[PDB]
Design a binder for this molecule. Structure first.
Ligand SMILES: CCC1(C)CCCCC1
Ligand SMILES: CCC1(C)CCCCC1
Ligand SMILES: [Cl-]
Ligand SMILES: [Cl-]
Ligand SMILES: [Zn+2]
Ligand SMILES: [Zn+2]
Ligand SMILES: [Zn+2]
Ligand SMILES: [Zn+2]
Lengths: 327, 327
């Protein structure tokens, strides 16, 4: 059994400590190729990501799952470059996020299923690099096209065994509808992570997903604008709940019996052009540890609050492997 | 004085008979790279475009202006390939159409001006190919972002001398607002073509633009769903006015004194993924002549209606050169 990474297949044991929702760069299709100066340069972006993934690896990370799709401007050659230089495995994604272009938005369920299966089974672009996860998104009630996306992701997963991970607007409880669509296609909830679930404190929502077998993506732990004076765009993005508040949802779900269904991540990036200018600077001041925030700050916080080392290892190592390994 | 093409600078006399609004492929950024099977294959698309541009060249076309921007999925290497194989000059474009991604839509006027100037002055992507026109779009009242686009296009034109060409929803008279924005930035109307102007019969609108000095883009002459039974998507795209009706607007503006301000084109393509599946098949049944429709069918129609050979040469050769040559 093997997981596809940007440097090829790896064994389950090789994945190790895995961050399940991360990005090298949050962009748009074609954007880094057309406007590399937006990032300084392409080399500057590469160097920043290598440095950050090095720091993460020193803190114990072995693999990240880059959940950048086509419409986040995923550049698998950029991921392979960074992966080789930092010695951190990167799993790439297929699927569609919240910014599909017209050439995607006009497609049928069958067509999209073809595209997702191309990326899982054949390769991304002309690279031969295969995705190891399918990423999808809603922000409230699904648009007609997003329902097609969710159905195509389910079809792709059913044919291949690769899991599905989601973006939600957690305040709208989107995982409810997402689950409904997925289940209508026959997808097992154990193949699905409902992401950005740490953006809500609603335990009735979180446990109702976990009770049916979903994995719960508590994937934005360091996202917080607390004590950012009067920066409306950072507040709108990051929220005003503390990282501790978010991290305590890990403990909460442990305490309810769902330790095997928890997936934790930073949802960090090294470049971010699909938001306001200089947001990466703002984010990096909030969390200078970047992708190392989970091991360096979250794990010790949870140990101080009484969570066991063994439970945290199961969450950071066992759960990601179970989720990623195709089934 | 020179015009930039995808194979480098050419003299004004080399441009010859020029179609001012065309596309090799109407797509989305990254799409042909990620999903070439949508088109059959990349080679099939190339071969179809070469065959079509050959037929056009035999009918007298020497240059086309490919008004595909970043968000139409412009692939300048594809254009150079096709240009070399067909021996037809292709002018490429910068700017933004109606499907900009978030990494564009979040940008300032100053940022966009940087991007358009990159594509005109330095090159597209890492190709060294420079755009020779800036393309912009509204569909009714401009969105806030589209106003920034129009202003940045004006700034880019003011620094470089390259012209601006527009997409409109002609039924909403968008050229009125477009002109207002452009003039507020100090752009000369003689540097601007208001496109898709053949989609309306409103001569008060058309003459009010031409009176202030705009060029008028009568650029979709073969676009018609007349006698396509019950195909709602083709009707919505193409309209139910005949090609003759559209072509008679050429004569109308001649007859009002605006022969030097008329630009004519087919607004054809060889691939079209940003609309419904199989639309290219539908379009190619309506107009099997493709980009040769203007010389093969429009020019003789207008001669039969009393327009002179010399006037039509001025419209197909002189006007494009005047417009494209930087000033
Ligand atoms: C009983 C919950 C537990 C104490 C198990 C070991 C890891 C930490 C959580
Ligand atoms: C007078 C308008 C004109 C007859 C001039 C020559 C070309 C055709 C139009
Ligand atoms: Cl702490
Ligand atoms: Cl005729
Ligand atoms: Zn997300
Ligand atoms: Zn993300
Ligand atoms: Zn248009
Ligand atoms: Zn066009």
């Amino acid at each position: 059994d093997r997981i596809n990474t940007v440097r090829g297949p790896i064994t389950i044991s090789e994945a190790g400590f895995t961050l399940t929702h991360e990005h090298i760069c949050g962009s748009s299709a074609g954007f880094l190729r057309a406007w590399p100066e937006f990032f300084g340069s392409r080399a500057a972006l590469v160097e920043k990501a290598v440095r950050g993934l090095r720091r993460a690896r020193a803190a114990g990370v072995r693999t990240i799952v880059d959940v950048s799709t086509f419409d986040i401007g995923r550049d698998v050659s950029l991921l392979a470059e960074v992966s080789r230089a930092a010695d951190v495995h990167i799993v790439a994604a297929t699927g569609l996020w919240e910014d599909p272009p017209l050439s995607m938005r006009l497609r049928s369920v069958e067509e999209l299923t073809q595209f997702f299966l191309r990326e899982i089974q054949y390769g991304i672009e002309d690279t031969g690099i295969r995705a190891g996860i399918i990423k999808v998104a809603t922000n409230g009630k699904a648009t007609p096209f997003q329902e097609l996306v969710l159905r195509a992701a389910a079809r792709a997963s059913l044919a291949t065994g690769v899991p599905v991970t989601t973006h939600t607007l957690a305040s709208q409880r989107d995982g409810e509808q997402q689950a409904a669509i997925f289940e209508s296609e026959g997808l097992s909830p154990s193949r699905v992570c409902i992401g950005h679930s740490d953006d809500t404190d609603d335990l009735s929502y979180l446990t109702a997903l976990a009770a049916r077998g979903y994995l719960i993506g508590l994937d934005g732990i360091p996202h917080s604008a607390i004590g950012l004076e009067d920066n409306a765009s950072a507040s709108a993005l990051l929220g005003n709940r503390s990282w501790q508040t978010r991290a305590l949802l890990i403990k909460a779900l442990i305490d309810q019996g769902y330790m095997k269904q928890i997936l934790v991540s930073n949802d960090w990036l090294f470049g971010f052009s699909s938001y306001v200018t200089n947001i990466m600077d703002v984010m990096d001041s909030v969390n200078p540890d970047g992708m190392a925030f989970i091991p360096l700050r979250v794990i010790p916080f949870l140990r101080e609050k009484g969570v066991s080392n063994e439970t945290l290892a199961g969450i950071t190592v066992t759960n990601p492997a179970r989720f990623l390994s195709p089934t």
